[PDB]
Amino acid sequence: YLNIFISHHEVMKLMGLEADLFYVHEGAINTYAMHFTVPVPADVHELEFSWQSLIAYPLPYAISIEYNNDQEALGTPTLSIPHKGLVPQEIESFLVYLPCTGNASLQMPVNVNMVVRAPPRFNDTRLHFKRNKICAKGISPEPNQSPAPAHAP
Ligand SMILES: *[C@@H]1O[C@H](CO)[C@@H](O)[C@H](O)[C@H]1NC(C)=O
């Protein structure tokens, strides 16, 4: 009833291979793949997840993040979607932003927790995505709002 996967482009960005990876396929969790800790290079500033509900019954989701607050190398992770809502019935993708400050070099765990509530005939999908974020000094995401020369009137 539920697909959760990372696309070909996401696997190429993260790992350099041409493949996709379904972490959940029609409700079945890829427990083997969930064991792995995926490294996130210094120059990768976001993780992209893709998902799709395969039924009409509403699928509530909840997303939480695990990371050490108390350091100077990684800024606060954010989402491109609300941390709670419904899983879409068309394939959609969302981002977990992992913005390294560029003011420090460091490796650290960042884990993404997801819970998708199931209709009563199935069991909830509980996921613990393990990632190890690399940060490097002088490597940080660029802003997309561009500067403009300014002077006083
Ligand atoms: C953000 O978009 C701007 C376009 O103004 C571009 O200069 C920059 O390279 C982009 N950076 C990222 C991380 O998307």
Coordinates of C-alpha atoms and ligand atoms in Angstrom, one line a residue:
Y1 CA 0.0 0.0 0.0
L2 CA 3.1 2.2 0.4
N3 CA 6.2 2.8 -1.7
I4 CA 9.2 4.7 -0.2
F5 CA 12.3 4.8 -2.4
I6 CA 15.3 6.9 -3.5
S7 CA 15.5 7.6 -7.2
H8 CA 18.2 6.8 -9.7
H9 CA 19.4 10.4 -9.5
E10 CA 19.6 10.2 -5.7
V11 CA 21.6 7.0 -5.8
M12 CA 24.0 8.5 -8.3
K13 CA 24.3 11.7 -6.2
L14 CA 24.9 9.7 -3.0
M15 CA 26.8 6.6 -4.2
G16 CA 27.8 6.8 -7.9
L17 CA 25.7 3.9 -9.1
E18 CA 22.9 3.7 -11.6
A19 CA 20.1 2.1 -9.6
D20 CA 17.2 3.1 -7.5
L21 CA 16.5 1.7 -4.0
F22 CA 13.0 0.9 -2.7
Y23 CA 13.1 1.0 1.1
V24 CA 9.4 0.2 1.3
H25 CA 7.7 -1.6 -1.6
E26 CA 3.9 -2.2 -1.5
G27 CA 4.1 -2.1 2.3
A28 CA 7.1 -4.5 2.6
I29 CA 10.1 -2.9 4.4
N30 CA 13.5 -3.5 2.8
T31 CA 15.0 -4.5 6.2
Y32 CA 18.4 -5.4 4.7
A33 CA 18.9 -1.9 3.1
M34 CA 17.6 -0.3 6.3
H35 CA 20.6 -1.8 8.2
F36 CA 23.1 0.3 6.3
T37 CA 24.5 3.7 7.3
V38 CA 24.6 5.8 4.1
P39 CA 27.4 8.4 4.0
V40 CA 26.5 11.9 2.8
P41 CA 29.5 13.7 1.3
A42 CA 30.6 17.2 2.2
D43 CA 29.2 18.6 -1.1
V44 CA 25.8 17.0 -0.8
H45 CA 23.5 19.3 1.1
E46 CA 20.1 17.5 1.0
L47 CA 18.6 14.0 1.0
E48 CA 15.7 13.4 -1.4
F49 CA 13.1 10.8 -0.5
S50 CA 10.2 9.8 -2.8
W51 CA 7.0 8.1 -1.9
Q52 CA 3.5 7.2 -3.0
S53 CA 0.4 5.8 -1.3
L54 CA -1.1 3.0 -3.4
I55 CA -4.5 3.2 -1.8
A56 CA -7.2 5.8 -1.3
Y57 CA -7.4 5.4 2.5
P58 CA -5.4 8.3 4.2
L59 CA -1.9 7.4 5.3
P60 CA -0.7 9.8 8.0
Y61 CA 3.1 10.3 8.2
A62 CA 5.4 11.7 10.9
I63 CA 9.0 12.7 10.3
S64 CA 11.7 13.3 12.9
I65 CA 15.4 13.9 12.8
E66 CA 18.3 12.8 15.1
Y67 CA 21.4 14.9 15.2
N68 CA 23.7 16.4 17.8
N69 CA 22.6 20.0 18.4
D70 CA 25.8 21.0 20.0
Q71 CA 28.3 21.5 17.2
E72 CA 29.4 24.1 14.7
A73 CA 29.7 22.1 11.5
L74 CA 26.1 21.3 10.6
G75 CA 23.2 23.7 10.7
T76 CA 19.6 22.8 11.7
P77 CA 18.1 20.2 9.4
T78 CA 14.8 21.2 7.9
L79 CA 12.2 19.7 5.5
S80 CA 10.7 20.7 2.2
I81 CA 7.3 19.4 3.5
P82 CA 5.5 19.6 6.9
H83 CA 6.8 17.1 9.4
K84 CA 3.3 15.7 9.6
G85 CA 0.6 15.2 6.9
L86 CA -0.7 12.5 4.5
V87 CA 1.4 10.5 2.0
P88 CA 0.5 11.5 -1.5
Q89 CA -1.2 9.2 -3.9
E90 CA 0.9 10.5 -6.8
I91 CA 4.6 10.0 -6.6
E92 CA 6.2 13.0 -4.9
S93 CA 9.6 13.8 -3.6
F94 CA 10.7 15.8 -0.5
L95 CA 14.0 17.0 0.8
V96 CA 15.8 16.8 4.1
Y97 CA 18.2 19.7 4.1
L98 CA 21.6 19.0 5.8
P99 CA 23.4 22.4 5.5
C100 CA 27.0 22.2 6.6
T101 CA 28.3 25.5 7.9
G102 CA 31.6 25.3 6.0
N103 CA 33.2 26.7 9.3
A104 CA 34.3 23.2 10.5
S105 CA 35.2 19.8 9.3
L106 CA 33.4 16.8 10.9
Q107 CA 31.6 13.5 10.4
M108 CA 28.5 12.9 12.5
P109 CA 25.4 10.7 12.5
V110 CA 22.1 12.2 11.1
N111 CA 19.2 9.8 11.2
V112 CA 15.8 10.4 9.7
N113 CA 12.8 8.7 11.4
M114 CA 9.6 8.1 9.5
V115 CA 6.3 6.6 10.7
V116 CA 3.4 5.9 8.3
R117 CA 0.2 4.9 10.0
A118 CA -1.5 2.0 8.2
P119 CA -5.2 1.2 7.7
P120 CA -6.4 -1.4 10.3
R121 CA -5.7 -4.5 8.2
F122 CA -1.9 -3.8 8.2
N123 CA 0.9 -2.6 10.5
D124 CA 2.4 0.8 10.7
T125 CA 5.7 1.4 8.7
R126 CA 8.4 2.5 11.1
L127 CA 11.7 3.5 9.5
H128 CA 15.1 4.6 11.0
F129 CA 17.2 5.9 8.1
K130 CA 20.8 5.9 9.2
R131 CA 23.1 8.5 7.6
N132 CA 26.6 9.8 8.4
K133 CA 26.9 13.4 7.3
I134 CA 30.4 14.6 6.2
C135 CA 31.1 18.3 6.5
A136 CA 34.2 20.2 5.3
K137 CA 35.5 23.7 6.0
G138 CA 34.7 25.9 3.0
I139 CA 32.0 23.5 1.7
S140 CA 28.4 24.8 2.3
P141 CA 25.2 25.1 0.2
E142 CA 25.0 28.2 -1.9
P143 CA 21.9 30.4 -1.5
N144 CA 19.6 30.8 -4.5
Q145 CA 18.6 34.4 -3.7
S146 CA 21.2 36.3 -5.6
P147 CA 22.8 39.6 -4.5
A148 CA 22.2 42.9 -6.1
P149 CA 24.4 46.0 -5.8
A150 CA 23.0 48.6 -3.4
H151 CA 23.6 52.2 -2.4
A152 CA 21.7 54.7 -0.3
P153 CA 19.2 57.1 -1.8
Ligands
LIG1 C1 21.0 28.5 -6.1 O1 20.5 29.2 -7.2 C2 21.4 30.3 -7.6 C3 20.7 31.0 -8.7 O2 20.5 32.4 -8.3 C4 22.7 29.7 -8.1 O3 23.6 30.8 -8.2 C5 23.3 28.7 -7.0 O4 24.4 28.0 -7.6 C6 22.3 27.7 -6.5 N1 22.8 26.9 -5.4 C7 22.2 25.8 -5.0 C8 22.9 25.1 -3.9 O5 21.2 25.4 -5.5

